[PDB]
Amino acid sequence: FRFIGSNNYYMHYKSNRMIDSVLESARDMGIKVLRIWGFLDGESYCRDKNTYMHPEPGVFGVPEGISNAQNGFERLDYTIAKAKELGIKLIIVLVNNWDDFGGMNQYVRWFGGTHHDDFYRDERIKEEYKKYVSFLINHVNVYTGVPYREEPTIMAWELANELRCETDKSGNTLVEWVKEMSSYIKSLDPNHLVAVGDEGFFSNYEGFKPYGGEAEWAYNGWSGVDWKKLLSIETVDFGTFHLYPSHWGVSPENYAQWGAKWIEDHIKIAKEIGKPVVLEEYGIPKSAPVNRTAIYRLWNDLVYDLGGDGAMFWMLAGIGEGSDRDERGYYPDYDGFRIVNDDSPEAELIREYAKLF
Numbered sequence: 455f456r457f458i459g460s461n462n463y464y465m466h467y468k469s470n471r472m473i474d475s476v477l478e479s480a481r482d483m484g485i486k487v488l489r490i491w492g493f494l495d496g497e498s499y500c501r502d503k504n505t506y507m508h509p510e511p512g513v514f515g516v517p518e519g520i521s522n523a524q525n526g527f528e529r530l531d532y533t534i535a536k537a538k539e540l541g542i543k544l545i546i547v548l549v550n551n552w553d554d555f556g557g558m559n560q561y562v563r564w565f566g567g568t569h570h571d572d573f574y575r576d577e578r579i580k581e582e583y584k585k586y587v588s589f590l591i592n593h594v595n596v597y598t599g600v601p602y603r604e605e606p607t608i609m610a611w612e613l614a615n616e617l618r619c620e621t622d623k624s625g626n627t628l629v630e631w632v633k634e635m636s637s638y639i640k641s642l643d644p645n646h647l648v649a650v651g652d653e654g655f656f657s658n659y660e661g662f663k664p665y666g667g668e669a670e671w672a673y674n675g676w677s678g679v680d681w682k683k684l685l686s687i688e689t690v691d692f693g694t695f696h697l698y699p700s701h702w703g704v705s706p707e708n709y710a711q712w713g714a715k716w717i718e719d720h721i722k723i724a725k726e727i728g729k730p731v732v733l734e735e736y737g738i739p740k741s742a743p744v745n746r747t748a749i750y751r752l753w754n755d756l757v758y759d760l761g762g763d764g765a766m767f768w769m770l771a772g773i774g775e776g777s778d779r780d781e782r783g784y785y786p787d788y789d790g791f792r793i794v795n796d797d798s799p800e801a802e803l804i805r806e807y808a809k810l811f
Contacts (some may be wrong), residue, residue, distance in 0.1 A: 458754070458808040459487035459545075459766030460793070461735055464785070465533040465556075466491055466526045467505035468775075472785065473533050475772025479795035481540045484808025487609060489734055489766055491531065492546035492798040494526045495556025496563075505529060508556070511582050512563050512702030514589040520755075525623055527593055534607050535597035543609040545734070547651050548587050549573075551616040558614075571621040571678075574631040584638055587611075593641045603643045611639055612689040616696065618677040625657050625680030629687070636689035651734070652719055654695025655679040663777075665715040669702040672716075681720075685727050692763065693724045696754070706742050710749045714756055718720035721760045724769040737768045737791035754807045765811075767793060768802065 462476050465488075470552035472707055480488055494507035497517075503636045506516040507526035516523045530546075534797045547625035558573035562771075565578050573579050591611070596603050598696050602608060613635050619627045628675055640723045656662055657675030659682065671677070685693040699709040717733060724731035736753060750767065757765040771792050784794050793800050 455763070456758075456811050457486040457543075457764045458484060458804060458811050459488045459732075459734070459764050459802075460485050460770035461657055461766060461768045463491045463772050464771075465522060466494060466507070466530045467503040467780075470532060471770055472775060473529070474536060475617070476770060477533070477536050477540045477542055479772050480542050481651065483770075483795055483801070483805050484811075485542070485770065485804065486808070487545060487764065487766065488537070488770070489545040489547065489551070489597070489612075490530075491555060491615070492530060493549050493557075493586075495549070496560035497547065499556040500526075502746055508586050512585065514586065514810065518559060527590070527674075528596060531593075531597050534595055534602070534605060538598065538605070538607040542607070542776060544607055545649075545651075545736065546590075546591065546608055547612040547615045549583060549614045551614055551618055555746055559723040570623060571619045571627065574619055580631075580634070583635070587635075588642055591639070596643075604645060604739045608646060610647040610649055610691070612649050612694070614640075614757045615651050617650060617652045618679060620676065620678055622678045623675050625675060625678055625683055627684050628652075628678055632684050632690065633687050636687060637692050640689050648688060649692050649694050650684055650731075651679070651694055652679050652681065652684065652696075653735075654681050654693070654697075654716070657683075659723075662719055665712040666705070666708045668704045668708055668712060669699065672702055676802070682723055682727070685724060685729055685731075687794060690729075692730040693720065693727075694732055694734045695720045697733060700739045700742060706744050709738055709744055710752055712751050713749065716729070717753055717756045718760065721762045724811070725761070731758055732764040732765070732766065733762060734766045735768040736765070737789075740787065740791040741790060747803050750800060751807075752804055754803075756811060758807070765807075767791075767800075770794070781788075 657680035
């Protein structure tokens, strides 16, 4: 099973029309796997989207006494039931490293901590995360009758989007937390694959240095992630990595070759450990002084030729509505990475590669 995939983060709070548009676009473009968020933590973030998943500890769904709100488990149920009809597989991520949709810091606020990385260490936080993930994995989809634990449309659970632990540059904190949480998920759900959902950073491996000396922090362990150690965990089934040279400090003339080396290095390491590897997010800003389509082609060619299992661009969007609608009626390109099912050279390249993978 090898694939072109993509990401979309709004499948748990937008309307049926907007969810159908993304999944129909995925089917029409040949995109086989979509990576989505399965979290919405904190009362303020839930209220901002009028959609509730985990507004406070021990509260899963809409708080008693709030009317006129969406339940994010019902929206995820609709997305999964539509994906199942349309033949799209889903990777569902269970918490965010970052503050968007609450993330780890929202759990730290609930529990009175004093740093983001307390998420990995405080047993009261770890217990709440386990309570959330058990509620979600056991949830019965209201459109199919099948609990997520038994739903083959879900390809994989991921522990945490872009997890980092800068306060422990040994990597040991995240190894312990990934072991504990991936084993916990396998105890709830023996059917599904589990992966971490991290960016793929290395921790000073002999003979692995960055192209051109740029973005060295991604190679030298600064984020607290030791990807090779994480991939060697028994209860982790496949490796994930992300790729954003512009955000990471690479110069425009080096984006293509930095990316190419990062892909080569990850596939070489995963192939030696003997597990599958997915480039699950990548992006070049639309405004970069290089040809974005040509960089995407290069990177997809490398994943394909070197035997990586998947390449997933960030990100696919569909039609928009309300205050998220741009000059053509689509959900807007807010970050400079959006691709839609149109006549752009990026859209055409994805349609071409989805026939190859």
